[PDB]
Design a protein around this ligand. Sequence first.
Ligand SMILES: *[C@H](O)[C@H](C[C@@H]1CCNC1=O)NC(=O)[C@H](CC(C)(C)C)NC(=O)OCc1ccccc1
Ligand SMILES: *[C@H](O)[C@H](C[C@@H]1CCNC1=O)NC(=O)[C@H](CC(C)(C)C)NC(=O)OCc1ccccc1
Lengths: 306, 306
Amino acid sequence: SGFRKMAFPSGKVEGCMVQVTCGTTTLNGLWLDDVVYCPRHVICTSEDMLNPNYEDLLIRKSNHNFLVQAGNVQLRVIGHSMQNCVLKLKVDTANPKTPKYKFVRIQPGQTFSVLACYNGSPSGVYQCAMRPNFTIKGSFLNGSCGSVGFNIDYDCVSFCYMHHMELPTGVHAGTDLEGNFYGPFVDRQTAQAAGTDTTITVNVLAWLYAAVINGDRWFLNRFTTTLNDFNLVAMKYNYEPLTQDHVDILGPLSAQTGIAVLDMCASLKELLQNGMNGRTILGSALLEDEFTPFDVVRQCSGVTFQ
Amino acid sequence: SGFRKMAFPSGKVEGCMVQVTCGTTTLNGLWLDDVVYCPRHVICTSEDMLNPNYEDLLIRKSNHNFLVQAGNVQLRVIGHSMQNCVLKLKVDTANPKTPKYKFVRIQPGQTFSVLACYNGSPSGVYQCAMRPNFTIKGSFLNGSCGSVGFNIDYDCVSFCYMHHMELPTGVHAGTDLEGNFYGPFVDRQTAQAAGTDTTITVNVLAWLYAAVINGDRWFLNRFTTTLNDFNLVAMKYNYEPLTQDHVDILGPLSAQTGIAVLDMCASLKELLQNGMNGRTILGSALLEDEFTPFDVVRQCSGVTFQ
Ligand SMILES: *[C@H](O)[C@H](C[C@@H]1CCNC1=O)NC(=O)[C@H](CC(C)(C)C)NC(=O)OCc1ccccc1
Ligand SMILES: *[C@H](O)[C@H](C[C@@H]1CCNC1=O)NC(=O)[C@H](CC(C)(C)C)NC(=O)OCc1ccccc1
């Protein structure tokens, strides 16, 4: 037993991480087969970055302008092209460590693992959720761009995120691996801001189920509510609405604990209206919303990955 | 910016993880050079596990009783021996993925990364602190024994923990890699219990510094205190005493923020006596004590590992 915010093993991704330097800019790239993917703003300099025209900037580039460092082996660039906000640098060596992989785009409310990297070298791994406002609460310093986020399904790495920038509230924005931003952001230094967030209601309920499985029961009650009456409470506390599909997703956790989904909603209602009164749930004094129902079932059952 | 509980990249450890089966017991082993290390209770069965004599049990064993699975390649055992509570199974193949490594024993208050594994396959990675009472708050199911905890220093893996068991409060106990338990526990099914814990004061202060670096300042104040007057407050809230060496360790974070260590102690004092009053620090409504001063400097500066 026990419940921890848990990342996927990062080994398969570590072997894809490289260093890309163009001019005065160094960032990370993702080397799969004979292509290195990286944020397109590597072709910029500090005055290009106010309002650039990347198409104009890219035609002015040469293959030899791109220095790609795979550990201590160089990588010769033999072609380049831009796809939305990422660059595709085609190199003369296929990565012999290429795992099987997919480029997927995730939904707000879904989680993934981030391998933070600097200078092509992995630094740490941790779990993030895509917020309803398309930002992520990460840990990123200068040089971390091109770090990726991912999930692993048996042996297959599904890449879902590439890091590009930090917003003024200290949260982070990036693209999928086809170069398309999550949310209404641009890879330019403008007055960009996150915009209003909400709490991921189905995830909180999943975490409450994780708590019951692990022996935290004090917030349980005899009461029930209807989906509609719950959602008027959710609205008032800036939780997002609970759908019947969310109820269906929570079915397995309901079955395992014997606690009906709408009864857990009644428990959440009281927690929202009364607070916790000095008590904790799974070592937290806050209602946690960055664990999906899948995350709870994975950890509270022991699924592995080869 | 941003602050996350962050594990080390797990790749170097993933390539050492194997499956060990003896009789009816399957658990994980750690394959370094031509030795596989695993918990000695693999030689047990469900009635051996009430009060066993492992020396008697081990002389009755044969090399061929130990099935070692390295992915889908078998491993032939050619010798065995017991070192304290671990087994050393000497195999006919050295692990070509052996990183440079050390066997170290850690101090309560120190952190490490755990690679949770089942059937020799890594499942997830997460950060743990060794509690003052020599337990760890982990996430471990049946079959997770032999999962290891570790730190990475540049390219060298320092193994500090091997998992053996869960205590009645849902916390976890294990050994170092020489087989010696952390704390007053035995690898037998008896009435064992954790015993009283305390909060790691120097780590809380480090985390408060992490907060100031990341822009959380509301808990700061003009006040100060002496080390002695702080420690009478620490005593009353079950925090452990703050030494001058702890103050010295916090020096760099003090220098970087311009907040004197004893002034942060005054801030902690008020947080202890007043609570947080509905506010959060780094997304937490609790005072967090599982980040070391080193952890804060690493993350708030960007150190990597090759
Ligand atoms: C790429 O390495 C970098 C990652 C940033 C640096 C600090 N935290 C991060 O996540 N991205 C940037 O520097 C982007 C550049 C572009 C606007 C995409 C061209 N700028 C940015 O994030 O500005 C905000 C910022 C920068 C530095 C420190 C704090 C905030
Ligand atoms: C080894 O895989 C296993 C790990 C336990 C299983 C549940 N959580 C864990 O961390 N260790 C044990 O089963 C040990 C066996 C020995 C006493 C070392 C021989 N027993 C144990 O942990 O008992 C407590 C327990 C067992 C199962 C579920 C909850 C609590």
